[PDB]
Ligand SMILES: CC(C)CCCCCCCCCCCC[C@H](C)CCCCCCCC(C)C
Ligand SMILES: CC(C)CCCCCCCCCCCC[C@H](C)CCCCCCCC(C)C
Ligand SMILES: CC(C)CCCCCCCCCCCC[C@H](C)CCCCCCCC(C)C
């Protein structure tokens with residue numbers, strides 16, 4: 001359509017949907033409780049992602065925010081996307097190590113403050129305050145990843161599995177605040193169509209790729 | 223008032239409130255844990271429903287959406303209603319059969335995508351895309367009901383109880399996407415005042431009736 | 445800034461942030477599960493509160509509502525604040541006595557109807573209906589506190605601890621609907637800058653003070 005980033009919203013819609021289906025069919029048959037939790041958690045993300053990517057593609061997940069002298073297109077559906085799918089990722093990581101509730105409660109709460117303050121940053125009309133919200137949202141993320149290491153006697157399956165998804169996690173998660181800071185929402189260094197592609201690349205890798213790495217091990221079975 | 227559907231919003235407000243009270247007084251005395259969960263879940267729905275029906279009655283739960291050449295009155299409070307009360311219904315059904323977490327997580331998540339995409343459909347200005355959101359929301363519902371049967375060794379109390387509320391569930395739940403598709407939100411086949419009545423009839427039967435069928439058995443006691 | 449209540453939004457921002465930090469550092473080291481839940485719950489509130497107080501301070505958490513012949517400044521971030529932090533308080537109180545799920549589900553649900561209908565009251569343009577929402581929100585709160593006493597064999601630690609925070613709870617919680625009713629949102633008896641101070645005084649005492657009373661006892665340790 002008229003928006004150059006359309007192609008990347010369409011490709012991400014497509015990869016999120018083909019990914020959930022894969023996951024659905026993959027999930028049919030399974031009857032292991034625990035396994036019935038990663039499939040759930042793991043399948044729902046691009047499931048939710050699918051709808052949120054489609055809401056962007058069709059234009060619903062978009063709003064205009066004025067700042068720095070203009071009308072900046074802002075896809076709030078991302079935050080609705082992540083606010084629902086980041087704890088799924090942290091729940092998959094959490095259940096993985098068997099985290100006590102107090103820390104899981106601490107992770108999703110920092111999580112909604114992370115997405116929550118990320119979304120506040122996204123829609124704040126005062127340019128310099130956008131970077132205050134980023135800094136608090138980055139400190140919460142920066143907080144979560146700190147727990148993601150020394151925040152916690154596991155089986156060598158889930159654990160080695162835990163190294164991967166955590167390292168893929170720091171790099172992936174930390175890449176998100178850099179793309180925000182450099183794209184149209186932040187300094188405006190990188191064009192929205194490139195930022196959209198970077199986010200869809202992280203989202204598909206986060207949703208589908210990270211998905212394709214977790215459930216393909218017996219780290220998930222009880 | 224000026225809106226012909228007012229009478230049905232007022233009657234539903236009334237039946238939701240008299241229903242929660244019934245449930246409240248009914249619930250006082252009870253000290254069985256499990257039983258303390260159906261009363262909770264079961265009472266809260268028309269409790270929440272009451273407030274959401276009243277917000278419609280008083281006009282707050284209403285917004286105007288342009289499409290197909292006009293300003294269509296849209297009661298978003300329904301989705302806020304269902305987004306909060308449909309998992310209560312699925313939690314009552316779920317706890318009922320004792321569903322593992324992975325499937326309960328899978329049901330509420332499809333559930334918020336169901337209400338979530340239903341609400342997206344409801345407020346999307348592009349007429350043909352409204353029917354795409356309906357189709358995904360119907361596929362999630364269509365998904366949930368599929369689990370509602372072959373998605374799972376129970377006592378003959380909860381189980382026979384489970385036949386009822388599930389069958390009342392498929393017919394009730396499946397009636398909702400038909401009323402949406404045929405009313406003002408969808409094809410506009412049926413007037414808003416008739417659609418409102420159908421929804422309030424399903425909502426009262428869903429909230430109060432379905433309520434009046436569950437807790438009046440020892441299928442709920444531990 | 446131009447708003448006289450700014451000073452109180454700035455002080456509350458500050459006290460909420462210094463308070464979470466205190467709590468964070470206090471929380472580092474702890475490895476007791478249960479204790480890892482009060483710190484979580486307890487720390488997150490002024491954590492969330494911090495961001496919501498800052499969103500008010502910077503102007504984001506504010507909207508204008510017309511009624512009684514004018515444009516009344518309304519800080520919706522409070523409800524987003526409380527909707528997220530009141531169940532944390534009730535979870536701290538709940539876990540404290542070890543409440544069965546049915547009642548905890550019943551408390552947060554009345555809770556979101558309390559904040560939920562409080563927020564509806566806050567943004568309703570019809571003046572007399574604002575007081576209907578207050579009355580339902582007060583009845584839910586009035587409901588929660590009723591459970592807060594006779595809504596439930598505990599250790600003399602958590603229990604005596606329970607007397608305090610509950611009594612501090614009724615007075616604190618009940619003070620909130622009085623400040624609402626008397627401030628700019630309600631009868632307009634008390635100026636917004638005084639109402640803001642009263643709420644920040646309750647919020648800081650609720651978030652930080654109530655915080656500073658709970659975790660400083662072994663009522664929290666397992
Ligand atoms: C064969 C299997 C395992 C999966 C393929 C199903 C297709 C849809 C989504 C999965 C695609 C690829 C794996 C995810 C990995 C990535 C790091 C995602 C970023 C790349 C984006 C475009 C490149 C191609 C791919 C989408 C296959
Ligand atoms: C006597 C008991 C069990 C309940 C009556 C309390 C009143 C309020 C709500 C309950 C009403 C009726 C039972 C619910 C069943 C229905 C299928 C609802 C649809 C009907 C709507 C109008 C018809 C009358 C009734 C509301 C009694
Ligand atoms: C020394 C410790 C325990 C705490 C101090 C850290 C500072 C920040 C927040 C804590 C402040 C005070 C305790 C909370 C109690 C109150 C009833 C709050 C209302 C008072 C507001 C202003 C008065 C001063 C104080 C904020 C210290």
Ligand SMILES: *C\C=C(C)/C=C/C=C(C)/C=C/C1=C(C)CCCC1(C)C
Pocket residue numbers: 081082085086089114115117118119121133134137138141172173174176177180203206207
């Ligand atoms: C969908 C999956 C992933 C893991 C999404 C993760 C996204 C982030 C981790 C976001 C952090 C953000 C922060 C830290 C800074 C401001 C805005 C963001 C929301 C992009």
Ligand SMILES: *C\C=C(C)/C=C/C=C(C)/C=C/C1=C(C)CCCC1(C)C
Pocket residue numbers: 303304307308311336337339340341343355356359360363394395396398399402425428429
């Ligand atoms: C309040 C109780 C009940 C069971 C509500 C159930 C409602 C639905 C099941 C809705 C499904 C919808 C779908 C399937 C299609 C588009 C829009 C709806 C939200 C009405």
Ligand SMILES: *C\C=C(C)/C=C/C=C(C)/C=C/C1=C(C)CCCC1(C)C
Pocket residue numbers: 525526529530533558559561562563565577578581582585616617618620621624647650651
């Ligand atoms: C942040 C901590 C506390 C305990 C906040 C508690 C707030 C209330 C208890 C609010 C009740 C309200 C009611 C009862 C009446 C209408 C509006 C309010 C939301 C202020």
